[PDB]
Write an enzyme that holds these catalytic residues in place. Sequence first.
Site, PDB file in Angstrom:
ATOM      1  N   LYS A  62       0.845  -1.187   0.000  1.00  0.00           N
ATOM      2  CA  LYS A  62       0.000   0.000   0.000  1.00  0.00           C
ATOM      3  C   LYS A  62       0.883   1.241   0.000  1.00  0.00           C
ATOM      4  CE  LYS A  62      -3.460  -2.869   1.445  1.00  0.00           C
ATOM      5  NZ  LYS A  62      -4.686  -3.237   0.685  1.00  0.00           N
ATOM      6  N   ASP A 240     -17.619   9.887  33.629  1.00  0.00           N
ATOM      7  CA  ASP A 240     -17.465   8.495  34.036  1.00  0.00           C
ATOM      8  C   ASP A 240     -16.812   8.403  35.412  1.00  0.00           C
ATOM      9  OD1 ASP A 240     -16.737   7.195  30.661  1.00  0.00           O
ATOM     10  OD2 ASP A 240     -18.516   8.140  31.523  1.00  0.00           O
TER      11      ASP A 240
END
Length: 325
Positions: A62, A240
């Site tokens: 690639k 959280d």
Amino acid sequence: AHNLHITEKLEVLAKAYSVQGDKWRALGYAKAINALKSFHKPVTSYQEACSIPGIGKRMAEKIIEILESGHLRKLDHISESVPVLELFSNIWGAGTKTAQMWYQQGFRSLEDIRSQASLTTQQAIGLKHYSDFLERMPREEATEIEQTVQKAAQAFNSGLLCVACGSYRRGKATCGDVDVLITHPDGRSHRGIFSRLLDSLRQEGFLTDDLVSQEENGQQQKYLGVCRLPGPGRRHRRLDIIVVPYSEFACALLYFTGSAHFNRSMRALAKTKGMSLSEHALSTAVVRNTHGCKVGPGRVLPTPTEKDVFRLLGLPYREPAERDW
DNA sequence: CGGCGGTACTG
DNA sequence: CAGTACC
DNA sequence: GCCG
Ligand SMILES: [Mg+2]
Ligand code: NA
Ligand code: NA
């Protein structure tokens, strides 16, 4: 940051694979991209490609196509569904399965979702805060949020220890949410306090939505929700909170500080050494089958401090800012 | 060939 | 349980 | 996708 010309194109591919549910291929891509980003000099050869850890023949080929033709033909054959899949799975609570299902049902826009899709309670909240949940807050605001939680916690037990973790502790300038870890040095006073804390934070109108919060369970470990500081100019932010036993403090802190890839690398390393690492404990003499699955528990190793976890793993300690992979 | 982190809620 | 989430 |  010396291979933007290639990595920029690879991140597009990785993202496509990710939203389409091809998790392992996406993972492979993630490791290659990260690798390429840490590699000082512009890779110039197919040989010099394979050279780097995280990169193989496939990926090398690639990179060769991108430096010669200055292009990546695969980017031209990405499914048209991908932008929509990404739009959908950016809803908190909807993943690749849900996104692919919505797409198959003909939905193409959040307007389609709002009007026609069947939504979980979580997803409805996610959608209502779609833009907000995509923004990062300045670390200064994270401090304000941690302090709001800490104050409400220390109000009914001054002994509680509260620390903001995640990207905040790793020292970033902006944070996706606020991760507050709470424990207690006395080893027992941490028990059943989500009850008190959440009620206190709701009392002041600070919490606006709950996403994950098992309050029927006296054994709740986490609260995932949404808060908003008072006054003008304020956005809803994701919050959280985890409450842990003092004995699990170091492992909890390490986990909650991240990054995600860092945690995975650490845990992957532990397994090579016949050990196991989780947000609860570092374990030794872990028995596993031929398929990598835990067949025998082993012993929990004493870990008073993060340093100990590194040490027991045969690793040099890293400051939080250095775990930012 | 086959694992790629280990865990906690939801429904 | 599968899906999603956490870092 | 990569790698043992
Ligand atoms: Mg965070
Ligand atoms: Na999502
Ligand atoms: Na609940």
